[PDB]
């Protein structure tokens, strides 16, 4: 009757997102230094593929970004990109 939290395996195809956080930078959420999806353009590819603001980037194209630095999360995301994220 509701969803408290879930993990998705969303594959985008070009990204129209803006990742925030990462170990060593002021966290997006109150106490989570992990990489987050902060802004998602309504039109872009990420929007259509199911990515939503507030998702927690866990793994990108087989590389694990669980507890990784900011430029590690960016380097992993800068044609086709599959990301695995945690929600609520």
């Amino acid at each position: 009757a509701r969803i408290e939290e879930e993990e998705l395996t969303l594959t985008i195809l070009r990204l129209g997102i803006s990742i925030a956080g990462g170990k060593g930078s002021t966290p997006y959420k109150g106490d989570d230094e992990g990489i987050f999806i902060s802004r998602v353009s309504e039109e872009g590819p990420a929007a259509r593929a199911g990515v939503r603001v507030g998702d927690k980037l866990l793994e990108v194209n087989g590389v694990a970004l669980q507890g990784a630095e900011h430029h590690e999360a960016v380097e992993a995301l800068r044609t086709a990109v599959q990301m695995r994220v945690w929600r609520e």
Binding site: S18, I19, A20, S38, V74, L77, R78
Partner: peptide, 5 residues
């Protein structure tokens, strides 16, 4: 830090 991607 909001980085564009």
């Amino acid at each position: 830090i909001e980085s564009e991607v």
